[PDB]
A paper describes a structure:
The TAdV-3 fibre protein has 454 residues, of which 1–45 are probably the tail domain that binds to the penton base, 46–303 form a putative shaft domain with fifteen triple beta-spiral sequence repeats and 304–454 may form the head domain. Here we describe the crystallographic structure of this carboxy-terminal end of the TAdV-3 fibre and confirm it as a globular, trimeric head domain which, surprisingly, most closely resembles the structure of reovirus fibre heads. We compare the structures of the virulent and avirulent fibre heads, and show that, in both cases, the head domain can bind sialyllactose.
To obtain information on the binding site of sialyllactose, we soaked crystals of both the avirulent and virulent forms of the TAdV-3 fibre head with 3'- and 6'-sialyllactose. Electron difference density compatible with the sialyl group of the carbohydrate ligand was observed between two trimers in the crystal lattice in soaking experiments with the avirulent version with both 3'- and 6'-sialyllactose. The density for 3'-sialyllactose was stronger than that for 6'-sialyllactose. Density for the lactose group was absent and this part of the ligand was not modelled. The ligand binding site of the TAdV-3 fibre head is located towards the lower half of the trimeric assembly, away from the 3-fold axis and is constituted by residues Glu392, Thr419, Val420, Lys421, Asn422 and Gly423 from one monomer, and residues Gly352, Val353 and Met354 from the beta-hairpin of the neighbouring monomer. The carboxylate group of Glu392 interacts with O4 of the sialic acid moiety and, together with the side chain of Thr419, makes van der Waals contact with the acetyl group. The carboxylate group of the sialic acid interacts with the main chain amides of Asn422 and Gly423.
Numbering used by the authors:
A (entry chain A), B (entry chain A), C (entry chain A): 317 to 454
C-alpha cells in the first residue's frame, strides 16, 4: 500500500511520529522525527529523538532503559542497532552503539533501549539514527 | 502471505527456530528462539541463542566463526549487527557488536559470525539480539 | 517483482552496483559489489567497498563522510550500521561500527557514512558488510 502516518506517546507526552506499511504478515515501521538533512551542499545534520529520564521506568537494570508507550502499534520487533548519545547528569556525554526493540507487555507497546555502562546516572538518551523496523506478525 | 515456521540445525544438533515470509524476490526471516520479554512491568529479560565451540568450524581465522547448518533455507543474506556475549574458556566474557550473515557453500547454509579480538579462546557465543534478515533472491 | 539491477557512480567514477525491488511505497536495495564468500569449506572472505578521500566532499566535519553519487535511485533511507575499516594516510587502520544512509540533496543521491574519531586524516574507508536498505517512499 502507501505509507500511513502514526505516532506513539511517552509518559511525559512527547510524541514519537512514524510512517508504516502493514502488508500480509509484515509490518514495516519507520520513525520520522529525526530524518537527517544535508542543510547545504557540504554539511550533514543529524537530528535526535531526545528521551529524558522521566520517559523511562524505574528502577533501571543492566543498562536497559524501558520507554512505556501509548497508542501507535503493538509489535514484537526485531532488535535494531542505532547511534546513541547518552547525556549524564553532570552533562558529560557518550556516543554508543545502542540496541532498540519494540515489545508488548500487558497489551502496551514499550521501547527497549540497551546500551553500554556509563560512569553516572543518565539524564537523556538521544537517538541520532533513522530507525526502521521490519516486523513479522503472527 | 502468513509467517511460515522453519528451523536450521547445527553440527551438535542444536535447533535454530525461525518464522519467514517468502514473497516474489524477497525472503524475510526472523529467528524466534530468543525473543525477549518483559517478565513483569519493570524488568526486560534478554534471551540468548547459545552457540558453543563445537558448532563452529576449525580452524577459526580473523575472529570469524562459521556455523555450518542443515535444512532451513538457502540465502545469501545481508549482514546484520547484533549483541554478542562471548564467553572465554576461563569464563571471562565480553559484550560486543557482532556481525551475522547467512551464506551458502557447496549448497549448504552457514551462519557467519564476526566479532572483535578477545584475550583467549572462545567457549561460547551468545546472541542476545532478535535477528531478522531481509534477503533478495535472484 | 524480481530483483532489478542498477548502480550509482562516485566523483572518481567508481561504480557502486546494486539489486533492488520497488513495491508500492517500499524500496529495498542491496549493494552487491562485496558479497562475501566461503572460498573453500573453512575460510570466509569479506570483500570491501573501497571508498577513497576523493569520493568524499570537503571539508569533513564530525567524522561524517559524504559521498555524492550519480544515477541510481533517490531515497531517504534509514540508517544502517556496518563494518568499516578506516585506513589512515600513514597506513594505520581502524575497524569500526560505521553508520550509513542514503539521502538526497538538490535532487542528488548521497551516501552518508559516519564513524568514530581517528588519530589522523583518512585515506580510505572500506565497507566490509553486505548492505541492504529497506526504504519507505512517500
Ligand atoms: C515477547 C512476548 O512474548 N511478550 C508477551 C508477554 C510476555 O510473554 C509475558 O510475560 C508472558 O506471560 O505476554 C503477553 O501475554 C502480554 O503480557 O502482553 C503478550 C506479549 O506479547
Ligand atoms: C556468496 C557466494 O557467491 N556463494 C556461492 C559459492 C562461492 O561463490 C564459490 O566459492 C565460488 O566458486 O559458490 C556456490 O557455487 C556454492 O559453492 O554453493 C554458490 C554459492 O552461493
Ligand atoms: C532529508 C530531506 O528532507 N532532504 C530534502 C532536502 C533538505 O530537506 C533541504 O535542506 C531543506 O530545504 O530538500 C530537498 O528539497 C532537496 O534539496 O533535495 C528534498 C530532500 O529530500
Amino acid at each position: 500500500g502507501r505509507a500511513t502516518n502514526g505516532q506513539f506517546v511517552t509518559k511525559t507526552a512527547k510524541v514519537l511520529r512514524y510512517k508504516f506499511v502493514r502488508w500480509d504478515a509484515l509490518l514495516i515501521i519507520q520513525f520520522i522525527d529525526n530524518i537527517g538533512v544535508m542543510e547545504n551542499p557540504t554539511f550533514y545534520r543529524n537530528k535526535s529523538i531526545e528521551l529524558r529520564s522521566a520517559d523511562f521506568l524505574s528502577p533501571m537494570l543492566n543498562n536497559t532503559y524501558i520507554v512505556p508507550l501509548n497508542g501507535g502499534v503493538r509489535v514484537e520487533s526485531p532488535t535494531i542497532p542505532v547511534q546513541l548519545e547518552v547525556i549524564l547528569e553532570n552533562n558529560s556525554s557518550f556516543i554508543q552503539v545502542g540496541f532498540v526493540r519494540l515489545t508488548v507487555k500487558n497489551g502496551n507497546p514499550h521501547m527497549i533501549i540497551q546500551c553500554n555502562p556509563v560512569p553516572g546516572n543518565i539524564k537523556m538518551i538521544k537517538i541520532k539514527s533513522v530507525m526502521l523496523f521490519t516486523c513479522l506478525i503472527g
